[PDB]
A paper describes a structure:
Interaction via their dimerisation domains produces a V-shaped Smc1/3 heterodimer whose two arms are connected by a central ‘hinge’ domain. Cohesin’s association with DNA as well as its abilities to hold sisters together and extrude DNA loops are facilitated by three large hook-shaped HAWK (HEAT repeat proteins associated with kleisins) proteins; Scc2, Scc3, and Pds5.
The other is an aspartic acid on the surface of Smc1’s hinge domain that is replaced by an aromatic residue: smc1D588Y. Despite its proximity to the Smc1-Smc3 interface, D588 does not appear to contact Smc3 residues. To determine whether the smc1D588Y mutation alters the hinge structure, we introduced the equivalent mutation (D574Y) into an isolated mouse hinge. X-ray crystallography revealed that a clash between the tyrosine residue and neighbouring loop causes Y574 to instead swing out relative to the position of D574, causing a local conformational change of the mutated loop. Importantly, the change had little or no impact on the overall structure of the hinge. Tyr574 swings out relative to the position of D574 with a concomitant local conformational change of the mutated loop. Despite this, both D588Y and D588W reduced the amount of Smc1 hinge that co-precipitated with Smc3 hinges. To address whether Smc1D588Y affects dissociation of pre-assembled Smc1/3 hinge complexes, we co-expressed either WT Smc1 or Smc1D588Y hinge domains with Smc3 hinges, purified Smc1/3 complexes, and compared their persistence in the presence of a fivefold excess of SNAP-tagged Smc1 hinge domains.
Numbering used by the authors:
A (entry chain A): 493 to 673
B (entry chain B): 493 to 683
The structure:
């Protein structure tokens, strides 16, 4: 059952108590797609990083994993904001017609969450349709990572992925988190 | 039988596998797109083998990428997906297209402390780019402390035999990992 969900929530509250101002929450707790029409694309690009736990430092991440291991809790991914190796967003890509930067369609509240979004989004772009997304991603010897509104993703590696119905259901989490507040 | 493997897989994951077979069957009923079936080579986990000392770290490294679909081309990939979504089928599907995969070599540091995961897998050389994509970036390291150093200094993910992960960008993953039979072991029995 959803005991898995309640149990990760207990672990999370425990480690928040253990390392008070060091564990911020899951990425899904800390940002939101700016408009409804982009929620599926944001959901697809973020992927499993929606549930990554954002922390300050590598030591916090290591201590948290050690706690989880001792308690026999399920594995978690920790993104230490101040240790992640990220490059600034390539703003020239805003000039590509038919495409927006995915990170431009996410808002986030503590300014330092920008670093987790740079990690998770990089220079991914969102396009209106599958044909637009494929042309911009594969059209050049310099490929791009693009995602259409239905969640079909084209990666620089040449990987292609999707599943529109599953992604629609996953994106319902965003409005639930907004309610929660 | 082979349903033991299915029970270990998770219905969200099986959904994409069943749906892909729905698309293929549909193409077969209409006598169209035989190149799609001929270019569909199955999932990653069905196309490699490794020694059991590596089951945990290989399986943790792949995660759901064990269920990525090796296919001939981006053509095969997009035709399946366009129909997949047309029919509003459940699941997610990811394709490794052999004609489009673009993989980057990186500098393995030669050390007893860390060895390439890729050279521990046995697979058909025709799928090399698919297996290099999933596994070519990860080293198997002797300890979390070595993992911490090598993943920081180089462009390789590090994982211990027990499954602790350090990404080459700083992402740390770990927790309690069962002694249950690996998905890889259950697949080994049906092969």
């Amino acid at each position: 059952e959803s005991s898995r969900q309640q149990r990760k929530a207990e672990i999370m509250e425990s480690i928040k108590r253990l390392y008070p101002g060091s564990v911020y929450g899951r990425l899904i707790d800390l940002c939101q797609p700016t408009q409804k029409k982009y929620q599926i694309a944001v959901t697809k690009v973020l992927g499993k990083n929606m549930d990554a736990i954002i922390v300050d430092s590598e030591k916090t991440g290591r201590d948290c994993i050690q706690y989880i291991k001792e308690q026999r809790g399920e594995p978690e991914t920790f993104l230490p904001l101040y240790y992640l190796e990220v490059k600034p967003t390539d703003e020239k890509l805003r000039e590509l017609k038919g495409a927006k930067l995915v990170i431009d369609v996410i808002r986030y509240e503590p300014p330092h969450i920008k670093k987790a979004l740079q990690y998770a989004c990089g220079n991914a772009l969102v396009c209106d349709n599958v044909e637009d997304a494929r042309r911009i991603a594969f059209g050049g010897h310099q490929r791009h990572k693009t995602v259409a509104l239905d969640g079909t993703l084209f990666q620089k590696s040449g990987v292609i992925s999707g599943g529109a119905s599953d992604l629609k259901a996953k994106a319902r989490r965003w409005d639930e988190k907004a309610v929660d507040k | 039988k082979q349903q033991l493997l299915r029970a270990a897989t998770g219905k969200a994951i099986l959904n994409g596998i069943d749906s892909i077979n729905k698309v293929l069957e549909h193409f077969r009923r209409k006598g169209i797109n035989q190149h799609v079936q001929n270019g569909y080579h199955g999932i990653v986990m069905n196309n490699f083998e490794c020694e059991p000392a590596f089951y945990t770290c290989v399986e943790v490294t792949a995660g759901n990428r064990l269920f990525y679909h090796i296919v001939d081309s981006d053509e095969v990939s997009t035709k399946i997906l366009m129909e997949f979504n047309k029919m509003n089928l459940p699941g997610e599907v990811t394709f490794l297209p052999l004609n489009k995969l673009d993989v980057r070599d990186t500098a393995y540091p030669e050390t007893n402390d860390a060895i390439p995961m890729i050279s521990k897998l046995r697979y058909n050389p025709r799928f090399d780019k698919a297996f290099k994509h999933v596994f070519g970036k990860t080293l198997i390291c002797r300890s979390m402390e070595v993992s911490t150093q090598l993943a920081r200094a180089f462009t390789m993910d590090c994982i211990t035999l027990e499954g602790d992960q350090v990404s080459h960008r700083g992402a740390l993953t770990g927790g309690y990992y069962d002694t249950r039979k690996s998905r890889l072991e259950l697949q080994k029995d049906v092969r």
